[PDB]
Design an enzyme around this catalytic site. Sequence first.
Site, PDB file in Angstrom:
ATOM      1  N   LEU A  20       0.719  -1.124   0.197  1.00 47.29           N
ATOM      2  CA  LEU A  20      -0.009  -0.040  -0.183  1.00 47.29           C
ATOM      3  C   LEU A  20       1.057   0.975   0.126  1.00 47.29           C
ATOM      4  CD1 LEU A  20      -2.902  -0.814   2.220  1.00 47.29           C
ATOM      5  CD2 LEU A  20      -2.435  -1.187  -0.129  1.00 47.29           C
ATOM      6  N   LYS A  27       7.082   2.483   5.162  1.00 51.12           N
ATOM      7  CA  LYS A  27       6.100   2.051   4.484  1.00 51.12           C
ATOM      8  C   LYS A  27       4.451   0.877   4.903  1.00 51.12           C
ATOM      9  CE  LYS A  27       8.425  -2.430   3.780  1.00 51.12           C
ATOM     10  NZ  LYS A  27       9.726  -2.829   2.686  1.00 51.12           N
ATOM     11  N   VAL A  28       3.742   0.972   4.196  1.00 56.27           N
ATOM     12  CA  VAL A  28       2.558   0.405   4.733  1.00 56.27           C
ATOM     13  C   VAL A  28       1.625  -0.700   3.030  1.00 56.27           C
ATOM     14  CG1 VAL A  28      -0.418   1.072   4.653  1.00 56.27           C
ATOM     15  CG2 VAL A  28       1.606   2.412   4.762  1.00 56.27           C
ATOM     16  N   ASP A 141      -0.009  19.465   8.823  1.00 58.64           N
ATOM     17  CA  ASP A 141      -0.277  18.358   7.537  1.00 58.64           C
ATOM     18  C   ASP A 141      -0.754  17.965   6.667  1.00 58.64           C
ATOM     19  OD1 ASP A 141       1.845  17.825   6.132  1.00 58.64           O
ATOM     20  OD2 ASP A 141       2.512  15.982   7.116  1.00 58.64           O
TER      21      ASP A 141
HETATM   22  O1  LIG Z   1      -0.088   6.814   8.126  1.00 56.37           O
HETATM   23  C1  LIG Z   1      -0.591   7.684   7.318  1.00 56.37           C
HETATM   24  C2  LIG Z   1       0.043   8.205   6.224  1.00 56.37           C
HETATM   25  C3  LIG Z   1       0.912   9.055   6.100  1.00 56.37           C
HETATM   26  C4  LIG Z   1       1.527   7.972   5.477  1.00 56.37           C
HETATM   27  N1  LIG Z   1      -1.902   6.954   6.843  1.00 56.37           N
HETATM   28  C5  LIG Z   1      -1.951   5.775   7.090  1.00 56.37           C
HETATM   29  C6  LIG Z   1      -1.800   4.438   6.518  1.00 56.37           C
HETATM   30  N2  LIG Z   1      -2.458   4.600   5.072  1.00 56.37           N
HETATM   31  C7  LIG Z   1      -3.721   3.554   4.687  1.00 56.37           C
HETATM   32  C8  LIG Z   1      -4.505   3.301   5.685  1.00 56.37           C
HETATM   33  C9  LIG Z   1      -6.097   2.108   5.474  1.00 56.37           C
HETATM   34  N3  LIG Z   1      -5.820   2.303   4.140  1.00 56.37           N
HETATM   35  N4  LIG Z   1      -5.125   2.916   3.301  1.00 56.37           N
HETATM   36  C10 LIG Z   1      -5.056   2.500   2.179  1.00 56.37           C
HETATM   37  C11 LIG Z   1      -4.511   2.146   1.468  1.00 56.37           C
HETATM   38  C12 LIG Z   1      -4.041   2.834  -0.115  1.00 56.37           C
HETATM   39  C13 LIG Z   1      -4.642   2.464  -0.456  1.00 56.37           C
HETATM   40  C14 LIG Z   1      -4.374   2.383  -2.472  1.00 56.37           C
HETATM   41  C15 LIG Z   1      -3.771   2.198  -2.899  1.00 56.37           C
HETATM   42  N5  LIG Z   1      -2.743   2.464  -4.172  1.00 56.37           N
HETATM   43  C16 LIG Z   1      -3.785   1.011  -4.830  1.00 56.37           C
HETATM   44  C17 LIG Z   1      -3.467   0.397  -6.418  1.00 56.37           C
HETATM   45  N6  LIG Z   1      -2.971   1.970  -6.664  1.00 56.37           N
HETATM   46  C18 LIG Z   1      -2.140   2.833  -6.224  1.00 56.37           C
HETATM   47  C19 LIG Z   1      -2.551   3.110  -5.242  1.00 56.37           C
HETATM   48  C20 LIG Z   1      -2.853   2.511  -1.992  1.00 56.37           C
HETATM   49  C21 LIG Z   1      -3.001   2.899  -0.802  1.00 56.37           C
HETATM   50  C22 LIG Z   1      -3.369   3.154   2.220  1.00 56.37           C
HETATM   51  C23 LIG Z   1      -4.035   2.949   3.652  1.00 56.37           C
HETATM   52  C24 LIG Z   1      -1.517   5.439   4.516  1.00 56.37           C
HETATM   53  C25 LIG Z   1      -2.531   6.693   5.238  1.00 56.37           C
END
Ligand SMILES: O=C(C1CC1)N1CCN(c2ccnn3cc(-c4ccc(N5CCNCC5)cc4)cc23)CC1
Length: 335
Positions: A20, A27-28, A141
């Site tokens: 993610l 990273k996530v 932010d």
């Molecule tokens: O703490 C943060 C920020 C400061 C980084 N958060 C919480 C942790 N994250 C998420 C939490 C909860 N849900 N979540 C979904 C995505 C996510 C969903 C889709 C994609 N894509 C899909 C395929 N195309 C590229 C992007 C990337 C990240 C990211 C997250 C990122 C946002």
Amino acid sequence: HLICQSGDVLSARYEIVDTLGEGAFGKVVECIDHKAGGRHVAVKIVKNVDRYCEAARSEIQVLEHLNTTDPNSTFRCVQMLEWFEHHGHICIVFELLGLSTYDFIKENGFLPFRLDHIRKMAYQICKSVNFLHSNKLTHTDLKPENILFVQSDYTEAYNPKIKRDERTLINPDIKVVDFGSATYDDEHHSTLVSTRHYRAPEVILALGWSQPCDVWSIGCILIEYYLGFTVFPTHDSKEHLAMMERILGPLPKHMIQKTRKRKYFHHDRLDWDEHSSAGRYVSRACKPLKEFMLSQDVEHERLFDLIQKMLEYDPAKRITLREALKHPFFDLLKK
Ligand SMILES: O=C(C1CC1)N1CCN(c2ccnn3cc(-c4ccc(N5CCNCC5)cc4)cc23)CC1
């Protein structure tokens, strides 16, 4: 910089199934939670690096407070399910959302959102961030990367006016994320504020900042959603101020009188050369705010009246989010 791939298990319960994305924070990953009936979750894996660890501990504190205060997520802050440590890394488990509003724009050829979606998104962002403001917090932010869609399904079609094929969300509902910079009223406010996509003038000029700097950021967010690009495309503080002056008019003399940030000024005017390379750019990219409007219909006039109040230079004069929620732009939603 945890080394990992799909198949790895974290905290002997969370199985990685997808990436993610990533940042300087770490990273996530998307995981299956084998101790919550197979629920898919997002796990933020923080770099073992002092700066990012400290932010993460502070984020965990903020999320525990917000989620206890608003257990139903009525105010749309992302829900933290738990946190743990894995090979020395802080790991924060979140409810799984869709992609960020920044990622949607990028995947939509940098085309802007439709005005009805902007209205709904603006309302929800103001409501969520006003909730933080009611609990003595400032986010600091806010930017498109830190607003996430609850569900990102879209349909696709040709647009005659704008030249091209366009993605349109089915449901534009959002949540607010990233509480790693969030600061309580009674906490130290770093007057040396680090890198930020949007920079309020009182932050740049080091005049003290608090909740109004969040309102500035939201104004910038809304213009970016409206255009598909930021009106402040720079990483340099002096250039930021130069762009502000082209877009919003001259900095107020009282703010220039008060500031210790003398590096930016020659006497009482910005120390800026309009005939340099950077000056030539600033002059072409920036122009008065209302000239960015794509239509003069009533709806667009109302959005821009709101953006203008949010981009008030003086942070005392600047509209509060409580006032913003009452602005006529949102009446359509209250009928
Ligand atoms: O703490 C943060 C920020 C400061 C980084 N958060 C919480 C942790 N994250 C998420 C939490 C909860 N849900 N979540 C979904 C995505 C996510 C969903 C889709 C994609 N894509 C899909 C395929 N195309 C590229 C992007 C990337 C990240 C990211 C997250 C990122 C946002």
